[PDB]
Design a protein around this ligand. Structure first.
Ligand SMILES: Nc1ccn([C@@H]2O[C@H](COP(=O)(O)O)[C@@H](O)[C@H]2O)c(=O)n1
Ligand SMILES: Nc1ccn([C@@H]2O[C@H](COP(=O)(O)O)[C@@H](O)[C@H]2O)c(=O)n1
Ligand code: NA
Lengths: 326, 326
């Protein structure tokens, strides 16, 4: 019962070797509140407490560590306004690699500062996706640096999948894993890890109502773009999924639900008040799906893990969300 | 993909509750020697280091603990020349239950003494299977005591299955579990635990060439007796499998191989010299199958757990086996 996929269980196992004693397993405690609400056992995987505040250090470290020395000498380049920038920057520091990160003008101040702190050279260029991405292109041509994709890359995908191995390690009798989706690298990685070892474990995706390239592609049967507008779950603001990640998702993901901006906010408020954890919109998507009622036939009297993918949210936004008549 | 079986995953979960803080998980370390020989990862589950020296305390404790107080007041009775006697006796002590164990005249001295030590009343009766079993019958009629089957009982089976849950707990990515068979309670319990959670995990049985009721039944497609003669694996000297255990095995067990007396001896010698553990014939069956070469297409480049079911062997027999030109 195999699959001819661009990533495989062996790739994840290599990633585990490369990350050992460098990147560490995150806590995954039971949530009493979500368990009570959902009438089933609910566990929170704290990738918000992973280094840099999201899981993205995993994929970036794997891809950078897997490079040959000749390749590491070339230097690397990446492009992000967010968590990928931080992961690539920190990974560069840990491995002693020279790295540039192209961030768009208009990228959030906190995230520019953080990726600076992590040691990589930050290049603020472009008020436009084409202008920003064209700088990365210009950098590849003239400098020969190696591009590090945020999700559409076999090594990046395989690094995110280490999360799936940790889940079955901490909870052998898990039934469902609920995973947020932007480009699809996170869920692709996890699906491969989970389905390769125990295919009876359900892997279910979650995206914002406002923007869900992958959901649209998943339900249409081919890659389509979808974006009606922006979202609180800014980490998963992706109109078009990656090629490798779509192939894997169509093959291995059980379902993908959609949640509204209000449900995401409610999920963040609930995580703060009832579980004492800070979450960005993307990090709360899975928990929003659990409260939506849409996963009810999967989660009642079962054990379900919700992925808290990230906690990189400006304090001003924390202030606003907690300050609402709520 | 369900099964209409006399035991189910919930029964094992109840057994886990009943055993918690009473019966404890056994170590399951890697064997370097067996891994080298088999060209795959091999792990030894040390049920020889379970209380009483075999796993049988698990099934007996579960069945006895599950009784109502009215039922516990009736007293219990069992029949064995070996490890079942010890498990029932110790379980009685732990639960404060009054128990009789009918052992055949001719039962090994060490095993009579041990079940005495464990507090139950020992009744030595019968030079004959019919004479011995008829005493248990006489005891049931006249005293109203509750009989405790060695394997053909849903609560007994479910207690042995706790071993399967421990395996996936200690090794989530296990591929094969190799289990000795007498009456079939051990393997039945494990199969249900393993297959209910992860059916991609292979469960494979092992019996002596000299006597293999279950193997014969498994390959014939109905219950048949088989016994050509006695065996070193005295714990698995059973001509006819139980009814409940056969139904489960036919349904859930991947294969059953047979090993010779020489292979069993070789396996015991190997466990002593290379892994420093004491094993009875039954406890070494699974390891004998691993060295036989018969499981080669399952174990190379995989992770396999061998069940060391028991260590209750007379020192005189240890002296003889280690004293051979070997
Ligand atoms: N200069 C920095 C560096 C890190 N951080 C944030 O602090 C959190 C913890 O970072 P470390 O894991 O690197 O300690 C992360 O969410 C990260 O984004 C920050 O807000 N400003
Ligand atoms: N009187 C006794 C009591 C126990 N034993 C054995 O000692 C080993 C350890 O027993 P305990 O787990 O009860 O300490 C077991 O194999 C058991 O059969 C014995 O040989 N003689
Ligand atoms: Na575990």
């Amino acid at each position: 019962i195999t699959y001819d996929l661009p990533v495989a269980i062996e790739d994840i196992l290599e990633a585990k070797k490369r990350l050992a004693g460098k990147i560490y397993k995150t806590g995954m405690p039971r949530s009493n509140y979500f368990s009570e609400r959902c009438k089933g056992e609910i566990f929170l995987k704290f990738e918000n407490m992973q280094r840099t505040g999201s899981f993205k250090i995993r994929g970036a470290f794997n891809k950078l560590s897997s490079l040959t020395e000749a390749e590491k000498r070339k230097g690397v380049v990446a492009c992000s306004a967010g968590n990928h920038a931080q992961g690539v920057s920190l990974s560069c520091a840990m491995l002693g690699i020279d790295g540039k990160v192209v961030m768009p003008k208009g990228a959030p101040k906190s995230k520019v500062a953080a990726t600076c702190d992590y040691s990589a050279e930050v290049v603020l260029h472009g008020d436009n996706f084409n202008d920003t991405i064209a700088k990365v292109s210009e950098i590849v041509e003239t400098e020969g640096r190696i591009f590090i994709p945020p999700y559409d890359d076999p090594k990046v995908i395989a690094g995110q999948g280490t999360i799936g191995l940790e889940i079955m390690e901490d909870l052998y009798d898990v039934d469902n894993v609920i995973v947020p989706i932007g480009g699809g690298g996170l869920i692709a990685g996890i699906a491969i890890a989970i389905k390769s070892i125990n295919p009876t474990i359900k892997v279910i995706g979650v995206q914002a109502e406002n923007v869900h390239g992958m959901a649209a592609s998943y339900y249409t049967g081919e890659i389509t773009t979808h974006r009606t507008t922006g979202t609180l779950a800014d980490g998963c603001d992706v109109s078009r999924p990656g090629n490798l990640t779509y192939e894997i998702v169509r093959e291995l993901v059980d379902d993908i639900v959609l949640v509204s901006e209000d449900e995401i906010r409610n999920s963040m408020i609930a995580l703060i008040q009832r579980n004492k954890v800070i979450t960005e919109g993307a990090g709360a998507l899975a928990c929003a799906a659990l409260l939506s009622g849409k996963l009810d036939s999967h989660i009642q009297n079962r054990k379900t893990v919700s992925i808290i993918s990230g906690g990189n949210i400006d304090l001003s936004r924390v202030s606003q969300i907690t300050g609402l008549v709520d």
